[PDB]
Design a protein around this nucleic acid. Sequence first.
RNA 1: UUUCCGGUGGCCAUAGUGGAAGGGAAACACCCGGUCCCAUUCCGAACCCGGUCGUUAAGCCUUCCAACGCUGAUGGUACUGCACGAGGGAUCGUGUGGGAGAGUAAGACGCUGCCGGAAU
RNA 2: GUCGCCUCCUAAAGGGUAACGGAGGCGCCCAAAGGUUCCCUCAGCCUGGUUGGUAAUCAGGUGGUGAGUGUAAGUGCACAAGGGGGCUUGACUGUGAGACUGACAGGUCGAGCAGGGACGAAAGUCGGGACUAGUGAUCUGACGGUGGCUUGUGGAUGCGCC
Lengths: 126, 184, 50, 136, 66, 78
Amino acid sequence: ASTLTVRKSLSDRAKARARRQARGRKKIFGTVERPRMVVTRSSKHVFVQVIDDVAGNTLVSASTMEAELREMSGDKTAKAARVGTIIGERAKAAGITKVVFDKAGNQYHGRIAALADAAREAGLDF
Amino acid sequence: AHEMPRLKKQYREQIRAAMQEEFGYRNPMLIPGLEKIVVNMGVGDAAHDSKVMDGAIRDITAITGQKPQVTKARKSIAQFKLREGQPIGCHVTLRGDRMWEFADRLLTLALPRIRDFRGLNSNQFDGKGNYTFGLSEQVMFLEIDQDKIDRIRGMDITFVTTAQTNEEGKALLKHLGFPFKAKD
Amino acid sequence: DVRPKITLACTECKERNYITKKNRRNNPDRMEMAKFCPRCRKHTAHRETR
Amino acid sequence: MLIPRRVKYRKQHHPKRTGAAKGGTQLAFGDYGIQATEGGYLTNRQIEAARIAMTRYIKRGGKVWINVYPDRPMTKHPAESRMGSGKGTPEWWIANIKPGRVLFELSGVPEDVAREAMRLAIHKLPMKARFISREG
Amino acid sequence: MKQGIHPDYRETTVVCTCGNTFTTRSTSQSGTLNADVCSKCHPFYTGKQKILDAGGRVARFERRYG
Amino acid sequence: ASSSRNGRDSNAQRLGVKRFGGQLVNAGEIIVRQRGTHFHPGDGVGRGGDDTLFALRDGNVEFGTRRGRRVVNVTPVE
RNA sequence: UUUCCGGUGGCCAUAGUGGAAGGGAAACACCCGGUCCCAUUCCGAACCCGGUCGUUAAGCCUUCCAACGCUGAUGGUACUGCACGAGGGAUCGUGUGGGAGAGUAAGACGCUGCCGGAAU
RNA sequence: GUCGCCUCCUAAAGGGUAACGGAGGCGCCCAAAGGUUCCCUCAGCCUGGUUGGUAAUCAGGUGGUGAGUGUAAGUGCACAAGGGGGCUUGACUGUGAGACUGACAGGUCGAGCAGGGACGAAAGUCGGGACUAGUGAUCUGACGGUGGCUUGUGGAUGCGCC
Ligand SMILES: [Mg+2]
Ligand SMILES: [Mg+2]
Ligand SMILES: [Mg+2]
Ligand SMILES: [Mg+2]
Ligand SMILES: [Mg+2]
Ligand SMILES: [Mg+2]
Ligand SMILES: [Mg+2]
Ligand SMILES: [Mg+2]
Ligand SMILES: [Mg+2]
Ligand SMILES: [Mg+2]
Ligand SMILES: [Mg+2]
Ligand SMILES: [Mg+2]
Ligand SMILES: [Mg+2]
Ligand SMILES: [Mg+2]
Ligand SMILES: [Mg+2]
Ligand SMILES: [Mg+2]
Ligand SMILES: [Mg+2]
Ligand SMILES: [Zn+2]
Ligand SMILES: [Zn+2]
């Protein structure tokens, strides 16, 4: 469900983040050569999906909701770094090589930046 | 230091209890509270000189405790001797503990020492629980000196509260403690 | 006269590489720029000729 | 005289005189009407003459509506001049009338005096027109 | 906070000249505060002015005639 | 007498669609000259400085909609 | 497999605007702080960070309402390619093909793909 | 009165189309009003508030484009191409697959590549400006660079090329 118009009655943070995400998606698009790495950052978790936007289907994904990461002791940024390592490992497992990173309306800073740097350490060409 | 402002503790305990018992909201996080304080100063007589603006900045920084937002002229108006881009106003937004301590200092010190003070009107509500009033002078704020003011100036104090209706906003400000008369 | 043509020459080889225009009232003085010198084969500082 | 307060363009092409009435073919204000059965250009002076005829016959009873406004400027070439040297200045204001257009409406007056007043008004128009009513 | 941008703000003792002192803090310099009056010291909401009005037309009639 | 105070028109610019839907084009072929983006660049179509839309690759021209925008695509030839 | 829900697309109002009621298991969200990375043309409002206490009040989600808006035939009409005809003239009509716009009946309180969570 | 260029209508839903037909503009401007990156949403209306009034400045609600766009008009742009912050000079050098448009001279768009840079975390974008006017062939001469030629040889001088 993606209506081109930002639905009214949304909260202020939601409206602002929706505008920022729509502006980020103007230049970012996932193909088979370079799929899009979208990081959805909420107050508790980070959910990463690598998407081929031509077919509209996610190739690999990772989160802090997985079984082997609920019990892992660390900080929000440390958990995001572990998620970045995992998503890089899964991308190498599926043969992704290079991705285009999408911050999904958030600032490239902190948890998202740690996730991206960890994915770069894993072997992702971005 | 590390000590919650007296106004904030009194607000929490007394005022939350009073609003819960008197308005009876069905959800605990519906009781209105003070969102922010906005101190505006229209300094429109600053197109011809800039030192009066140094005075305004000093006065309102001493009043509020933070540097102001100087606002440039939105559009040029020739009826006004007003061009575009010349800064013609300054406002301070107080939130957090700073808002509470500014409110306490204003209530205890500033407005009581107005000449022939008669309270503040309760009919100055905007229709959504937010209450604004204007001071034609700025010399009540005793935290500033007296023998070094450049020129006379006033301000607008605006209380923005999370009160849905005017009645509960008026109740909030009254129970926080405001001089409120019964005249127009 | 008010927007004249100005020649930018490299500060290394004195090569009159570029020509452009300015306002001569907004920029009364000679302009410094970081242009590419085909002779110096890299980006050098170019200055308006005098 | 009906002249618009202002027009966007004072020199305009001649209005098309082709086709039946686009709108205003049914009575909407009065109880009787003058319906044009022919097309043409209805000037403001003809509109005024017809209005005077109706208003003077019906006297004090009822109201008269003019459904057509002459907001189309027609230019005039400088007199005794050859052709060219630009377009002329506006001289006449017209309404573009098509067959079936209700020109005038009349109300508050019985049918025979209405018929006579509208006969008088119709004898002023440059096109053919007829008396119409609301099915009695 | 930043260094070298704000005026000095330290601990301060005050007097309300009405038996009231407080441990607030104010922007003053190397001294104390001496205020004319406080809010609790004010006669507004403690009820010490009782101005109301003076509109006894009949009252004045009866005072000056009866 | 008098004179005409009009009389000036600019030269014809010959804008419009040059390649219509389903037409086979080479890479770099111009699909439409236009002022502004009445058509937007789609997949395999680039936009020029004067808003000219050109083929970024070989294939067939198609006109369509992407989100809210009216776009020109060049679908690669099978 | 299914149900509900959190993200991410496609169609871009049949989807919205408005009203009424209800719900939060994981998730979402407000929320609580600002020590730390970071920030406000002033303000931890926002951006950013540490938590997940409290709360479903709002966001979000489920259901109901055609109310405003949106979608909308069939038939007819205007117009029109080609072939003709009529009038003193503005102009009009027919044959043979194509055929709206408005309006009416009506539809409609969204459809759908991938990833994930909980239960099954 | 007009003469070149740009925008709209006439122009009959591709392009083109005339008249001393109907409307207007241009012969610039901007070192940012260019590049890149990030963030933001307006005009109008309503209500509350010192000077302050319809309209300076502040606060809450509403408002989707009616505001804005350096400059005519049209096509666009709210995803903003509109408003703002940071850093910058690509307002490059050698090129140009392939095309559009004119009788031609000519006008216009352009992928990809190298060098050397700007911004960004990257993806990427940048060969001036949201687009379309702001311009003048050739001859002749001038200035900078280069050093290909030089009438016997070496210079000079002159020419050539950019
Ligand atoms: Mg109608
Ligand atoms: Mg461009
Ligand atoms: Mg250009
Ligand atoms: Mg319909
Ligand atoms: Mg039909
Ligand atoms: Mg229809
Ligand atoms: Mg055409
Ligand atoms: Mg045609
Ligand atoms: Mg011709
Ligand atoms: Mg240049
Ligand atoms: Mg070529
Ligand atoms: Mg041109
Ligand atoms: Mg390069
Ligand atoms: Mg720009
Ligand atoms: Mg010659
Ligand atoms: Mg010889
Ligand atoms: Mg060269
Ligand atoms: Zn050089
Ligand atoms: Zn006192």
